[PDB]
Design a protein around this motif. Structure first.
Motif, PDB file in Angstrom:
ATOM      1  N   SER A   1       0.837  -1.208   0.000  1.00 23.45           N
ATOM      2  CA  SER A   1       0.000   0.000   0.000  1.00 23.45           C
ATOM      3  C   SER A   1       0.883   1.274   0.000  1.00 23.45           C
ATOM      4  O   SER A   1       2.100   1.180   0.241  1.00 23.45           O
ATOM      5  CB  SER A   1      -0.915   0.006   1.229  1.00 23.45           C
ATOM      6  N   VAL A   2       0.247   2.448  -0.262  1.00 25.24           N
ATOM      7  CA  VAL A   2       0.873   3.786  -0.210  1.00 25.24           C
ATOM      8  C   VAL A   2       1.496   4.016   1.206  1.00 25.24           C
ATOM      9  O   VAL A   2       2.684   4.255   1.275  1.00 25.24           O
ATOM     10  CB  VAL A   2      -0.149   4.898  -0.579  1.00 25.24           C
ATOM     11  N   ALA A   3       0.702   3.874   2.310  1.00 23.41           N
ATOM     12  CA  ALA A   3       1.179   4.066   3.697  1.00 23.41           C
ATOM     13  C   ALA A   3       2.366   3.157   4.054  1.00 23.41           C
ATOM     14  O   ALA A   3       3.272   3.589   4.761  1.00 23.41           O
ATOM     15  CB  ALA A   3       0.062   3.783   4.688  1.00 23.41           C
ATOM     16  N   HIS A   4       2.296   1.889   3.656  1.00 28.00           N
ATOM     17  CA  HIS A   4       3.318   0.868   3.956  1.00 28.00           C
ATOM     18  C   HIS A   4       4.686   1.330   3.434  1.00 28.00           C
ATOM     19  O   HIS A   4       5.663   1.350   4.188  1.00 28.00           O
ATOM     20  CB  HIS A   4       2.907  -0.474   3.342  1.00 28.00           C
ATOM     21  N   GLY A   5       4.712   1.765   2.174  1.00 27.84           N
ATOM     22  CA  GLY A   5       5.911   2.308   1.550  1.00 27.84           C
ATOM     23  C   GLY A   5       6.371   3.574   2.255  1.00 27.84           C
ATOM     24  O   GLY A   5       7.550   3.711   2.565  1.00 27.84           O
ATOM     25  N   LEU A   6       5.432   4.506   2.545  1.00 27.00           N
ATOM     26  CA  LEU A   6       5.787   5.763   3.196  1.00 27.00           C
ATOM     27  C   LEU A   6       6.394   5.536   4.576  1.00 27.00           C
ATOM     28  O   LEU A   6       7.386   6.160   4.893  1.00 27.00           O
ATOM     29  CB  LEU A   6       4.565   6.685   3.329  1.00 27.00           C
ATOM     30  N   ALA A   7       5.795   4.666   5.380  1.00 27.67           N
ATOM     31  CA  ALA A   7       6.330   4.376   6.706  1.00 27.67           C
ATOM     32  C   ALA A   7       7.726   3.732   6.620  1.00 27.67           C
ATOM     33  O   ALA A   7       8.653   4.173   7.300  1.00 27.67           O
ATOM     34  CB  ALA A   7       5.351   3.519   7.487  1.00 27.67           C
ATOM     35  N   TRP A   8       7.895   2.735   5.773  1.00 24.94           N
ATOM     36  CA  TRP A   8       9.219   2.091   5.615  1.00 24.94           C
ATOM     37  C   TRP A   8      10.289   3.098   5.140  1.00 24.94           C
ATOM     38  O   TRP A   8      11.416   3.069   5.628  1.00 24.94           O
ATOM     39  CB  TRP A   8       9.124   0.893   4.672  1.00 24.94           C
ATOM     40  N   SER A   9       9.900   4.005   4.238  1.00 26.80           N
ATOM     41  CA  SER A   9      10.784   5.016   3.678  1.00 26.80           C
ATOM     42  C   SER A   9      11.186   6.091   4.660  1.00 26.80           C
ATOM     43  O   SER A   9      12.359   6.460   4.697  1.00 26.80           O
ATOM     44  CB  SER A   9      10.167   5.627   2.433  1.00 26.80           C
TER      45      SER A   9
ATOM     46  N   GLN B   1      -5.347  15.892  -2.822  1.00 21.54           N
ATOM     47  CA  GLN B   1      -5.761  17.138  -3.501  1.00 21.54           C
ATOM     48  C   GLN B   1      -5.357  17.142  -4.987  1.00 21.54           C
ATOM     49  O   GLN B   1      -5.837  17.988  -5.739  1.00 21.54           O
ATOM     50  CB  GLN B   1      -5.173  18.379  -2.793  1.00 21.54           C
ATOM     51  N   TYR B   2      -4.423  16.252  -5.389  1.00 18.83           N
ATOM     52  CA  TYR B   2      -3.941  16.216  -6.786  1.00 18.83           C
ATOM     53  C   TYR B   2      -4.752  15.217  -7.613  1.00 18.83           C
ATOM     54  O   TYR B   2      -4.669  14.014  -7.345  1.00 18.83           O
ATOM     55  CB  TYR B   2      -2.448  15.822  -6.833  1.00 18.83           C
ATOM     56  N   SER B   3      -5.462  15.681  -8.653  1.00 19.38           N
ATOM     57  CA  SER B   3      -6.260  14.783  -9.517  1.00 19.38           C
ATOM     58  C   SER B   3      -5.444  13.610 -10.095  1.00 19.38           C
ATOM     59  O   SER B   3      -5.942  12.496 -10.104  1.00 19.38           O
ATOM     60  CB  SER B   3      -6.983  15.549 -10.623  1.00 19.38           C
ATOM     61  N   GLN B   4      -4.177  13.854 -10.501  1.00 18.78           N
ATOM     62  CA  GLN B   4      -3.268  12.846 -11.087  1.00 18.78           C
ATOM     63  C   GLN B   4      -2.896  11.741 -10.121  1.00 18.78           C
ATOM     64  O   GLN B   4      -2.521  10.647 -10.556  1.00 18.78           O
ATOM     65  CB  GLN B   4      -1.990  13.526 -11.617  1.00 18.78           C
ATOM     66  N   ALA B   5      -3.000  12.011  -8.809  1.00 21.34           N
ATOM     67  CA  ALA B   5      -2.632  11.034  -7.801  1.00 21.34           C
ATOM     68  C   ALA B   5      -3.634   9.868  -7.664  1.00 21.34           C
ATOM     69  O   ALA B   5      -3.276   8.849  -7.085  1.00 21.34           O
ATOM     70  CB  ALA B   5      -2.392  11.725  -6.461  1.00 21.34           C
ATOM     71  N   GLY B   6      -4.870  10.056  -8.156  1.00 19.48           N
ATOM     72  CA  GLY B   6      -5.969   9.083  -8.083  1.00 19.48           C
ATOM     73  C   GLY B   6      -6.179   8.619  -6.658  1.00 19.48           C
ATOM     74  O   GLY B   6      -6.316   7.425  -6.394  1.00 19.48           O
ATOM     75  N   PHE B   7      -6.149   9.570  -5.721  1.00 17.72           N
ATOM     76  CA  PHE B   7      -6.162   9.287  -4.293  1.00 17.72           C
ATOM     77  C   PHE B   7      -7.248  10.117  -3.611  1.00 17.72           C
ATOM     78  O   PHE B   7      -7.177  11.346  -3.636  1.00 17.72           O
ATOM     79  CB  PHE B   7      -4.754   9.625  -3.772  1.00 17.72           C
ATOM     80  N   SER B   8      -8.257   9.454  -3.002  1.00 13.78           N
ATOM     81  CA  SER B   8      -9.399  10.157  -2.396  1.00 13.78           C
ATOM     82  C   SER B   8      -9.178  10.586  -0.944  1.00 13.78           C
ATOM     83  O   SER B   8      -8.234  10.130  -0.309  1.00 13.78           O
ATOM     84  CB  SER B   8     -10.646   9.281  -2.486  1.00 13.78           C
TER      85      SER B   8
ATOM     86  N   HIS C   1       4.106   4.370  -6.195  1.00 12.57           N
ATOM     87  CA  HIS C   1       3.170   5.480  -6.456  1.00 12.57           C
ATOM     88  C   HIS C   1       3.224   6.491  -5.303  1.00 12.57           C
ATOM     89  O   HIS C   1       3.421   7.687  -5.534  1.00 12.57           O
ATOM     90  CB  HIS C   1       1.754   4.929  -6.655  1.00 12.57           C
ATOM     91  N   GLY C   2       3.125   5.980  -4.075  1.00 11.87           N
ATOM     92  CA  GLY C   2       3.233   6.791  -2.869  1.00 11.87           C
ATOM     93  C   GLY C   2       4.608   7.427  -2.758  1.00 11.87           C
ATOM     94  O   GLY C   2       4.714   8.621  -2.497  1.00 11.87           O
TER      95      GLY C   2
END
Ligand SMILES: COc1cc2sc(C(=O)CCC(=O)O)cc2cc1/C=C\COc1cc2cc(C(=O)CCC(=O)O)sc2cc1OC
Lengths: 177, 177
Positions: free
Chosen positions: A1-9, A120-127, B4-5
């Motif tokens: 997931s997005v969060a999983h990568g962000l936390a590890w990074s 907030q970014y339409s290109q991100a496809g993230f709600s 992506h993230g």
């Protein structure tokens, strides 16, 4: 997931690199100003985790009882081609009834800001629904990592919060332990 | 996905904040040393994207024709509680047959390092196959973002490469355009 990568990074690319050298920087600053008791900077990095992903750049805006004291002497390290990449960290005083009740290094986990901006970014496809879900997952994952992390044992504290009491009192609650 | 993230975060939390102020910092440095022609630091940030995720901290290790010249004067900004958070960037000279052929700010995209490290941590549940797949996706996503990004038009260049000719020649190929 997005969060999983962000936390590890955030852990691998930031916490892993600053936490082994934080306590020596903290000890140098307290010994330079003979800081004892309440005026002694806590040995841990305090990381603010707002579940709403609202990350302001000035902490004296989220709560007025959080006041900037000094910058912790910079850490430098050669990093990915950046010679003497600078790790700056800020020391805050936590006020209670006008007087200094505690002292600690404090900052927000910047990946929470990214998650809000992504929504907030339409290109991100993230709600907005993805942002709240990923925010909770980022915190839980960071907690899971730090629990087993050898670099980051007794020198890091996560402060996750949801705005409905007091952020300063919440930091102080951890500081008093 | 993980890539992506990471790409959105590297853009929002780093590129978006340094690229609008990079050209003024570059112009200040070139005007300070009256740098003209080959000795003039390129107006763009050059970002190294190794598809193998091998991110060393010294660029003079991946290729000897990449030599450190100077640090670009630091940028500072209040960021997520860090007062005067420092953005350090390094200027390199690109050698060809012993002489300086070009001059540019150069660094690796640190999220590629995270992806490699993630694949080494059992808790990350991330394989070597995931690392190569996510590495390609991180580059493609960063390219997609920067293509439309208003902060980062003519002041950023992505250098994606796979080791089987020359990194220095590859940077020079972009520099000569
Ligand atoms: C918020 O997200 C980022 C922020 C930054 S800031 C950064 C640099 O400053 C480039 C050089 C370096 O990585 O030290 C790279 C990233 C990359 C990301 C992307 C994913 C999050 O993972 C990281 C968080 C992260 C936070 C960093 C900080 O310095 C904290 C303060 C701040 O974000 O301004 S370094 C860092 C590196 C990360 O991955 C490589």
């Amino acid at each position: 997931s997005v969060a999983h990568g962000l936390a590890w990074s955030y852990y691998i690319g930031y916490l892993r690199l600053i936490l082994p050298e934080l306590q020596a920087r903290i000890r140098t600053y307290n010994q330079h100003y003979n800081n004892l008791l309440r005026g002694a900077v806590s040995q841990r990095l305090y990381i603010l985790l707002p579940l709403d992903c609202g990350v302001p750049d000035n902490l004296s805006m989220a709560d007025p009882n959080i006041r900037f004291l000094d910058k912790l002497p910079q850490q430098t390290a050669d990093r990915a081609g950046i010679k003497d990449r600078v790790y700056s960290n800020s020391i805050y005083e936590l006020l209670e009834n006008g007087q200094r009740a505690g002292t600690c290094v404090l900052e927000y986990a910047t990946p929470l800001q990214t998650l809000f901006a992504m929504s907030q970014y339409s290109q991100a496809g993230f709600s907005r629904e993805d942002r709240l879900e990923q925010a909770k997952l980022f915190c839980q994952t960071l907690e899971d990592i730090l629990a087993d992390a050898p670099e980051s044992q007794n020198n890091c504290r996560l402060i996750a919060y949801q705005e409905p009491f007091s952020l300063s009192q919440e930091v102080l609650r951890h500081l008093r332990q």
